């Protein structure tokens, strides 16, 4: 029973605001203070539909699970597209510098 409630709800995108102070990163990152990052969670069980954005492999694996669950897990709800944010932070030489951080924001989810 130790888990989030994620059985009958299907693979989907959820909100998640991440504050850098809460992760102890305020002396590494000076701006922004946090970002809307989102996350994916939910089920990928048979049958999958087109909205689940599944790879062909995830479709094969889902059918293989249905049929003997011990042979393979079901695929997971993971991000299919992410975006970058820009961040101002101290680097290895303790210089502050602005750069792009890729793949930080979830834009969409899928069965993988």
């Amino acid at each position: 029973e130790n888990s989030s409630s994620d059985q009958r709800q299907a693979c989907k995108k959820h909100e998640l605001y991440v504050s850098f102070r809460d992760l102890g990163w305020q002396d590494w990152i000076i701006a922004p203070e946090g970002y809307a990052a989102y996350y994916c969670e939910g089920e990928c069980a048979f049958p999958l539909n087109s909205y689940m954005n599944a790879t062909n492999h995830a479709i094969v694996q889902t059918l293989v699970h249905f049929i003997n669950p011990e042979t393979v897990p079901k695929p997971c709800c993971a991000p299919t597209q992410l975006n970058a944010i820009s961040v101002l932070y101290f680097d290895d030489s303790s210089n502050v510098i602005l750069k792009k951080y890729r793949n930080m924001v979830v834009r969409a989810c899928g069965c993988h």
Partner: protein, 199 residues
């Protein structure tokens, strides 16, 4: 592969950049007490670069995309740099099935080459950018690629950044939460300094 434990997300050097999404709590903003050009100018010192930085941008007054396209085309007619090797090393030589004594003609050599050059050169357009109150100077001159056409024959490729340089400017940093204990510190702000034709 650089750092063994990946417990922070790594930074990347891809340009260009979206600017900080800044939070509007007014505690973070610097107030007029140390918003005085003179100490600002001395603290930044030699970082000061008036061709790239300003309290008040030339780009002002006393559709405009067709203008971008016309600027771009003009700039491509006087490409800077040296002719690239890949073009300079082009003798339109082998023609009659991988050659003739001369498929084209000397003259036509260089002219075809200059045309290849202007067609595939990718200029950096510049524009003034408002970084907001937390930076100083607040306005900085930022580079960009023109990517509303293709820079290859045949069509497919598009101009993208290929080199970058950094401006040094100042940031209003608040140590404690709520913006207690603020101050200005040098920060490196990147700008595109070259563009190149790319897939």
């Amino acid at each position: 592969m650089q750092h063994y434990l990946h417990i922070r997300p790594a930074p990347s050097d891809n340009l260009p950049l979206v600017d900080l999404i800044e939070h509007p709590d007014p505690i973070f903003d610097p107030k007029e007490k140390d918003l005085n050009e003179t100490l600002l100018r001395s603290l930044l010192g030699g970082h000061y670069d008036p061709g790239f930085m300003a309290t008040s941008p030339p780009e002002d007054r006393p559709g405009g995309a067709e203008d971008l396209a016309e600027l771009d085309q003009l700039l491509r007619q006087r490409p800077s740099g040296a002719m690239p090797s890949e073009i300079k090393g082009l003798e339109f030589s082998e023609g009659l099935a991988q050659g003739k004594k001369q498929r084209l003609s000397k003259k036509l050599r260089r002219k075809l080459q200059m045309w290849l050059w202007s067609q595939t050169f990718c200029p950096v357009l510049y524009a003034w950018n408002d970084l907001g109150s937390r930076f100083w100077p607040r306005y900085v001159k930022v580079g960009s690629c023109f990517s509303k056409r293709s820079c290859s024959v045949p069509e497919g490729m598009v101009c993208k950044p290929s080199k970058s340089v950094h401006l040094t400017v100042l940031r209003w940093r608040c140590q404690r939460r709520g913006g207690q204990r603020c101050g200005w510190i040098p920060i490196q702000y990147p700008i595109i300094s070259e563009c190149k034709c790319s897939c």
